[PDB]
Design a protein around this nucleic acid. Structure first.
Ligand SMILES: [K+]
Ligand SMILES: [K+]
Ligand SMILES: [Mg+2]
Ligand SMILES: [Mg+2]
Ligand SMILES: [Mg+2]
Ligand SMILES: [Mg+2]
Ligand SMILES: [Mg+2]
Ligand SMILES: [Mg+2]
Ligand SMILES: [Mg+2]
Ligand SMILES: [Mg+2]
Ligand SMILES: [Mg+2]
Ligand SMILES: [Mg+2]
Ligand SMILES: [Mg+2]
Ligand SMILES: [Mg+2]
Ligand SMILES: [Mg+2]
Ligand SMILES: [Mg+2]
Ligand SMILES: [Mg+2]
Ligand SMILES: [Mg+2]
Ligand SMILES: [Mg+2]
Ligand SMILES: [Mg+2]
Lengths: 95, 98, 283, 290, 60, 128
RNA sequence: CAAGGCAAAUAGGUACAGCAGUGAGGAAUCUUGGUCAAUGGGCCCACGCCUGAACUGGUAACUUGGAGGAAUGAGACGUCGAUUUAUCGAGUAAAAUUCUGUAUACAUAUUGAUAAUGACAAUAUGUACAUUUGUCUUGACUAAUUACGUGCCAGCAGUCGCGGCAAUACGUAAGAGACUAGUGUUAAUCAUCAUAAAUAGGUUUAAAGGGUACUCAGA
RNA sequence: AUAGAUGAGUUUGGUGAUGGCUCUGAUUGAACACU
């Protein structure tokens, strides 16, 4: 899944992507599904807030997957740890 | 006239009675004052029991029923018998020995 | 005359698929064959599903004798042979039924048993143990623990599993308390303190054995406390069982799942779709 | 009444995979395509294709309407946790650094280094992905008739339902005539010995027994349904596999439903002759049946 | 205690499950029951539970 | 809009949309019986060309609507009790209803083999 | 007590929105049954009487749940459909054989109830029987194809649309896709619709800033 | 109660917007047609 939530706007087409827990599946549209299935994502929940232009929809959601918040940059910026509770609890990353 | 009686609930050929405390002149299945317990007429059989015995499941709140009986509640014939078995009241009918 | 499709079928079924007519070799003979981890794959297109091994006939007896004759705790037998407590208990139940059949002079399915056991991979326990039968520490993935939470904490904080459980929820426990054999952790802590292995196993047995006593005690008190509320009044024909209960525990608005009585104000739901009208459990 | 959907059950043209040990089914499963081409097809066309393939095997004798409600979006899973790591470490090292963990050098720098870096501290095998996609038809494994077919007691799901409907199985030592009984963890279903021998036994050819009445060990009996001496079905070894959520006893033809099928990090306990790509598409179909 | 538990029932060998190992979602139960009455008040010790109260309202 | 303007009732229901078959949608009825008043031919509009088989019907309620006769050839005339169902002839202005063909007096197509249910045609019974 | 309807005549009853039932209206909704055995109620010292509530039987696919058959079946070395007479299909399909005894039928027992009373049925056990397909769709949305006929005609159509002489869309034929004792259509409701937006919208050029700002109430 | 949030067709020579209509899902104390 992706990191957190992203919202990208491309000339009237807004796409909101959320990171869902494991076993949620690609409960997304047909165009987003092809991209998630191809990039390697398996759990996501998208939404077209304003417009559903086929082209801009693909440009906005592709630009959203490249704008995910980097937990390590946010940590060094705030001087605070951003610990993934899921990893500490299970003593590793459960893929 | 407060009465301890049975409200019949269930489907066709599947009776399931509900012990209630309701005024005499009221609908049988109307919402009563209290629901003391439930009664199941059809006798059951222990799961892993081949002897052939049978029992009847009755969930009754003895403590609550006793209070109502002490203030003048009149249980019906069917409920009176059930209370007799528990020992709250004396039997209303007895088998003739002669 | 056979069509080409049928003709090709018998062509494949005569040379390539002939090895599946009779089972000559012992062990799985599936289509996928041996995988990367040495497990037969029944369906080639699906590599994840594998033909996992089954306890051999002689293995089931070893587990049965240990629990019954030696009276060892189930947790210890599970940890010893790396068999799940739920499976160890089942083998005993199934074995007890066998004793009944043999005691009642019933014919067993020996011809069928031997034939099927040669088609499934087996794990003979005892001396020649190569791998553990299965994982005895699997912990259910709780729904709360599946969320993606990045908690901002101090740069030098020692975030532990205890703190992780509290971040997921308030009532959640760490994975150290969800194990089916939690005594293993305590046993492994003795090895870190350079404790002799012999004494480490001694403490393990006592710990598990002591744990089974508590479980039995709780179960005993429960069943004994459930029969104290039931009044059995034998009669001419049947035996009436009057169960007691607090008739005031109907919640604050009358709606409560664990209440006793037929609810008022509900129409029969027989007409709704997917209405379960079958027994849900056999006691 | 044979319905129009069963007109072509093992057709070689359509090449469907069915839950049975029929030799025709074995040929279809063996020679099935490696990967159906789904590039040109649209999203609906892909989902519809996956639905047809998977539904030809999973619960084929269950009305589409019923299974649509039975499909659960709750895919259970477990995680293995060894006690060794629990004792030594308390999960503090997994947060060192910036929260995600102490970074390690890239793969292209390590090969140049003569000595490999120290291994990262974590549970053994804690990076493999868990196959959630291959768990869609898990609720069907709880059916009493499917569970019997997975215990190698019947030759197919259809035949496994016959035994239940005809009063041959007994759950927890009690007759169970309902093929839809959803087994609970701990239940013990036991099939009659005779029905299991006939199902898995070889066909009784009257011609083969003609030369047998004249010419451990079991004697030949000409008054039994299966062929004597009993022998396994011709093509039973290609489907001989027991799932991990069952503990069968061949002798008494009884099994225990230990738990529900669960997905572990590296495998799945749901028999399915379909790749994750197909199950993933099928799962999407039943989210909104479109 | 009527009859010993046979090896068929699941209660032959009790293996308690670990805490938080299942997520069964119970369905909402339709209907309600009448709320029994509060015989006593919410504060103070009522006169009905004194030494002699049944001998004063139900004398022999 | 501000929270104050919403207390004063600024959120009114959207303007209703006219239904396809008002006569039926009004009283929530799936069909209505009516006495045929006229059996005629209506002409399509800009794109389409042909001759549709409409019929002026007087419903039980009292309204006089113009229905449409689906199929090839009909059996209705003046003063024919016919059953009217919803629908609309897209290319015929003023025609917003259909007529059930297995209805009281309107007979289904006798030479129909495909989609008989839609035209009220009993099975041929060739062998039976 | 008054009025009208039916009945009534020198009388002064009746209104089935009590149960069953009839006519009418309508697209459309049931038996003029049995019993007070069970539960409840009225009267009664007691026994007991009464109960169209109620419990039971009947009618309807209106809905839901379940059954409605599984395994074997290759050389009848046949039949059919196409057509590249040898390719592609009907086809493991059929026949045939080997088993089961599901709904249901019958029989026995128990039980609904006990002080005693059983209208009617439920459950368990035993034996016995292998019984129908129907329907929509097939240009795209939307899973699934050719041939012929028709020639902006006849017709299809939820939306965009199709049909003017070699129509994948109309009508037949075959095939295919799909649901199934149901399948479609019509009507309605929620959702789709952030499509009256409190959560949660918008108003330069697209629906929408009052001609203006001093100001009571009110924010 | 922590898995629950999804789109498609149609305006234009064409593109991006605005904005309705319709389909995709579920259902009925339903009726009708073919069974
Ligand atoms: K257009
Ligand atoms: K103006
Ligand atoms: Mg828009
Ligand atoms: Mg138009
Ligand atoms: Mg056809
Ligand atoms: Mg009247
Ligand atoms: Mg009436
Ligand atoms: Mg009429
Ligand atoms: Mg009575
Ligand atoms: Mg009475
Ligand atoms: Mg009396
Ligand atoms: Mg029977
Ligand atoms: Mg009487
Ligand atoms: Mg298509
Ligand atoms: Mg048509
Ligand atoms: Mg056509
Ligand atoms: Mg049905
Ligand atoms: Mg202005
Ligand atoms: Mg003005
Ligand atoms: Mg222009």
């Amino acid at each position: 899944t992706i990191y957190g939530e992203v919202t990208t706007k491309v000339s009237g087409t807004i796409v909101r992507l959320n990171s869902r827990p494991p076993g949620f599946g690609l409960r997304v549209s047909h165009r987003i599904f092809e991209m998630c299935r191809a990039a390697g994502i398996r759990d996501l929940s998208a939404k077209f807030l304003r417009s559903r232009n086929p082209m801009n929809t693909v440009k906005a959601t592709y630009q959203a997957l490249l704008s995910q918040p980097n937990p390590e940059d946010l940590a060094i910026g705030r001087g605070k740890k951003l610990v993934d509770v899921r990893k500490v609890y299970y003593g590793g990353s459960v893929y | 006239v407060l009465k301890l009686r049975l409200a019949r609930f269930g489907r066709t050929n599947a009776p399931f009675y509900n012990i209630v405390v309701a005024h005499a002149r009221t609908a049988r299945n109307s919402k009563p004052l209290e629901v003391i317990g439930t009664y199941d007429p059809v006798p059951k059989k222990d799961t892993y029991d081949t002897t052939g015995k049978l029992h009847k499941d009755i969930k009754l709140d003895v403590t609550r029923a006793k209070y109502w009986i002490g203030v003048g509640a009149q249980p019906t014939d069917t409920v009176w018998r059930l209370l007799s078995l528990v020992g709250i009241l004396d039997p209303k009918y007895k088998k003739p020995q002669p | 005359v056979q069509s080409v499709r049928r003709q090709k079928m018998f062509s494949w079924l005569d040379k390539k698929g002939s090895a599946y007519k009779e089972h000559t070799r012992q062990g799985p003979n599936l289509l996928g064959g041996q995988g990367k981890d040495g497990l037969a794959v029944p369906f080639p297109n699906n590599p994840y599903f594998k033909s996992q091994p089954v306890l051999s006939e002689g293995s089931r007896e070893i587990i049965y004798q240990d629990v019954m004759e030696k009276g060892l705790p189930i947790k210890a037998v599970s940890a010893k042979y790396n068999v799940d407590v739920r499976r160890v208990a089942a083998v005993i139940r199934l074995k007890e039924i066998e004793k009944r059949w043999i005691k009642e002079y019933k014919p067993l399915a020996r011809p069928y048993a031997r034939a099927v056991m040669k088609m499934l991979p087996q794990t003979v326990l005892g001396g020649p143990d190569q791998k553990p039968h299965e994982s005895i520490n699997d912990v259910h993935v709780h729904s709360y623990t599946t969320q993606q939470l990045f908690v901002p904490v101090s740069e030098s904080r020692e975030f532990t599993r205890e703190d992780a459980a509290k971040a997921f929820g308030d009532h959640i426990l760490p994975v150290d308390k969800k194990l089916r054999v939690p005594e293993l952790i305590e046993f492994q802590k003795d090895l870190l303190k350079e404790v002799p292995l012999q004494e480490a196993n001694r403490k393990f047995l006592n710990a598990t054995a002591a744990s089974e006593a508590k479980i039995a005690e709780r179960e005993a008190k429960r069943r004994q406390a459930v029969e104290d509320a039931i009044t059995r009044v034998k009669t001419d024909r049947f035996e009436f069982r009057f169960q007691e209960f607090n008739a005031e525990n109907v919640g604050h608005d009358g709606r409560d799942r664990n209440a006793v009585g037929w609810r008022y104000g509900v129409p029969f739901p027989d007409r709704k779709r997917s209405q379960i009208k079958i027994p849900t459990k056999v006691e | 009444m044979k319905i129009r959907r069963l007109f072509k059950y093992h057709s070689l043209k359509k090449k469907p995979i069915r839950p049975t040990w029929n030799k025709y089914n074995l040929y279809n499963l063996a020679t099935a395509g490696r990967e159906p081409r789904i590039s040109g097809k649209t999203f609906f066309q892909q989902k519809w294709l996956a639905k047809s393939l998977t539904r030809a095997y999973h619960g084929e004798h269950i009305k589409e309407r019923k299974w649509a409600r039975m499909f659960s979006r709750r895919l259970p899973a477990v995680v293995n946790m060894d006690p060794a790591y629990m004792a030594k470490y308390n999960g503090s090292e997994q947060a060192a650094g910036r929260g995600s963990g102490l970074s390690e050098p890239p793969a292209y720098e390590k090969t140049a280094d003569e000595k490999p870096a120290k291994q990262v501290i974590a549970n053994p095998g804690r990076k493999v992905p868990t196959p959630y996609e291959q768990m869609t038809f898990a609720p069907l494994e709880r059916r009493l008739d499917i569970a019997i077919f997975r215990a190698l007691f019947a030759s197919s799901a259809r035949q496994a339902r016959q035994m239940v409907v005809h009063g041959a199985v007994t759950v927890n030592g009690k007759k169970m005539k309902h093929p839809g009984y959803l087994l609970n963890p701990g239940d013990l279903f036991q099939v009659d010995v005779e029905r299991v021998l006939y199902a898995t036994g070889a066909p009784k050819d009257k011609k083969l027994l003609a030369a047998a009445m004249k010419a451990e060990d079991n004697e030949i009996d000409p008054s039994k349904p299966y062929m004597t001496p009993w022998r396994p079905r011709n093509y039973m070894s290609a489907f001989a596999f027991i799932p991990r959520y069952l503990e069968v006893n061949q002798n008494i033809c009884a099994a225990v439903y230990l738990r529900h099928p669960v997905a572990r990090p590296g495998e799945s306990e749901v028999p399915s002759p379909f790749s994750p790509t197909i199950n993933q598409l099928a799962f999407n179909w039943y989210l909104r049946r479109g | 205690d009527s009859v010993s538990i046979p090896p068929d029932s699941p209660n032959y060998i009790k293996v308690p499950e670990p805490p938080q190992s299942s997520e069964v979602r119970h369905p909402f139960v339709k209907g309600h029951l009448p709320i029994p009455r509060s015989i006593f008040p919410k504060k103070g010790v009522p006169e009905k539970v004194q030494s002699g109260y049944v001998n004063r309202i139900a004398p022999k | 809009a501000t929270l104050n303007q919403v207390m004063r009732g600024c959120r009114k229901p959207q303007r209703a949309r006219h239904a396809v078959s008002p006569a039926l949608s009004s009283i929530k009825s799936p069909a209505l019986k009516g006495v045929c008043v006229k059996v005629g031919i209506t002409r399509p509009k800009k794109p389409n060309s042909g001759e549709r088989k409409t019929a002026r019907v007087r419903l039980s309620t009292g309204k006089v609507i113009t229905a449409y006769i689906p199929g090839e050839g009909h059996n209705i005339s003046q003063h024919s009790v016919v059953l009217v169902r919803g629908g609309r002839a897209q290319d015929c202005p003023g025609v917003r209803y259909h007529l059930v063909r297995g209805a009281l007096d309107l007979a289904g197509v006798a030479t129909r083999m495909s989609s008989r249910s839609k035209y009220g045609t009993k099975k041929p019974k060739k062998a039976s």
